[PDB]
């Protein structure tokens, strides 16, 4: 038991270990997504930049949890990072659609972590998740919301014109 541990219960400590792995996973997904749009037969450079940014952003989330773990005197245990669902994502609209469910997923995970931390009477941990993760998710989900909407109204996935112009005007 670390000299720093105080009010920090094993269930939280292992749930944090599960969020870390989850953040690392979205990172991988977003990486895959990104280089799908770099493909010569897809060629959408800004969609690519966007998901590459998202990806590096998820990796920051992972590291920040790893930092907390050490701050609270827990101990990190990392798993296999899982291969992502697809290795091809069809289109921008579909890419964004999966991105959105992925983030809704991670959000549910964060909420349960919070619900869990409330039960342990862990206020520091509660505020950490609120401060840094909850509003990021809300916004991240709102953002993806808007992009899908926009692509549909534009006539995607059907017209490849929409996806080109959205790459330029919304993401470029």
- Is position 115 an interface residue for a second copy (rule: CB under 8 A)? yes
Shortest Å, Cβ 126 to Ca ion = 6
Nearest Cα to Cα of residue 65 among 118, 2, 121, 136? 136
Query: Nearest approach, Cβ of 125 to Fe ion (angstroms)?
Result: 16
Binders of Ca ion in range 130-169 (CB under 5 A)? 130-131
Q: Is it true that the peptide bond before 157 is cis, omega within 30 degrees of 0?
A: yes
Choose the one of Ca ion, a second copy, Fe ion, none that binds residue 54, judging by a C-beta under 5 to 8 angstroms depending on kind. Answer: Fe ion
Among 140, 144, 148, 151, binds Fe ion (CB under 5 A): 140
Q: In whole angstroms, how close is the CB of 137 to Ca ion at the nearest point?
A: 15
- Asked if 54 is part of the footprint of Fe ion (rule: CB under 5 A), the reply reads yes
The footprint of a second copy on residues 37-66 (CB under 8 A) is 38-43, 45, 52, 59, 63, 66
First to last CA, the chain: 50
Q: If contact means CB under 5 to 8 A according to the sort of partner, which of Ca ion, a second copy, Fe ion, none does residue 109 touch? A: none
Structure tokens at 10: 């094993």
Q: How many whole angstroms from its chain centre is CA 139?
A: 12
CB of 39 to a second copy, least distance (A): 5
Largest alpha-carbon pair distance within the chain?
61
Among residues 68, 53, 56, which one has the least CA distance to residue 20? 68
Cα(34)–Cα(137) distance, rounded to whole angstroms? Answer: 20
- The answer to whether residue 127 forms part of the interface with Ca ion (CB under 5 A) is yes
């Amino acid at each position: 038991t670390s000299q720093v541990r105080q009010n920090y219960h094993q269930d939280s400590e292992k749930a944090i270990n599960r969020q870390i792995r989850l953040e690392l996973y979205a990172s991988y997904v977003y990486l895959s997504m990104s280089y799908y749009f770099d493909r010569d037969d897809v060629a959408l450079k800004n969609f690519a930049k966007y998901f590459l940014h998202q990806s590096h952003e998820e990796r920051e989330h992972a590291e920040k949890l790893m930092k907390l773990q050490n701050q609270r005197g827990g101990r990190i245990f990392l798993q296999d990072i899982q291969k992502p669902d697809k290795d091809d994502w069809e289109s921008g609209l579909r890419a964004m659609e999966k991105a959105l469910k992925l983030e809704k997923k991670v959000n549910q995970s964060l909420l349960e972590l919070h619900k869990l931390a409330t039960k342990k009477n862990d206020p520091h941990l509660c505020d950490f998740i609120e401060t840094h993760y909850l509003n990021e998710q809300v916004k991240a989900i709102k953002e993806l919301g808007d992009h899908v909407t926009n692509l549909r109204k534009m006539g995607a996935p059907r017209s490849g014109l929409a996806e080109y112009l959205f790459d330029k005007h919304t993401l470029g």
